[PDB]
């Protein structure tokens, strides 16, 4: 005797020793990315090509 | 006995040991950018190619 068995219920595992089908379908995907930047450019100039007389000493 | 079980209510975890499916769907994206600039150009000139006599001393 295997005990009471439901008639219309779907066949499910209920006790120790019962079998069950596992459909292994795994799809995992993780990603991450980052960046940082900094820039600085500086140019400066001053030139006196021709200096008038009253400015010579300066 | 597994206690009272609702008939029409959706199957939800209610007690310790109940299982729940988490659909991991994360999509985070942050960005920032900035810039600054400054420029200055100056040219000046004065020339006396031909100086009249009354202006010579000056």
Swiss-Prot record, chains A, B:
Which span of the parent protein is shown here?
59 to 116 of 232
What's the protein name?
Flagellar L-ring protein
Can you state the subunit structure given in the record? The basal body constitutes a major portion of the flagellar organelle and consists of four rings (L,P,S, and M) mounted on a central rod.
Give the subcellular location.
Answer: Cell outer membrane; Bacterial flagellum basal body
Please give the GO cellular component terms listed in this UniProt entry. Answer: bacterial-type flagellum basal body, distal rod, L ring; cell outer membrane
What keywords are annotated for this sequence in UniProt?
A: Bacterial flagellum, Cell outer membrane, Lipoprotein, Membrane, Palmitate, Signal
Source organism lineage? Bacteria, Pseudomonadati, Pseudomonadota, Gammaproteobacteria, Enterobacterales
- Name the Gene Ontology molecular function terms of this record: cytoskeletal motor activity
Q: What does this protein do?
A: Assembles around the rod to form the L-ring and probably protects the motor/basal body from shearing forces during rotation.
Q: Which family does it belong to?
A: Belongs to the FlgH family.
GO terms, biological process: bacterial-type flagellum-dependent cell motility
Primary residence: membrane
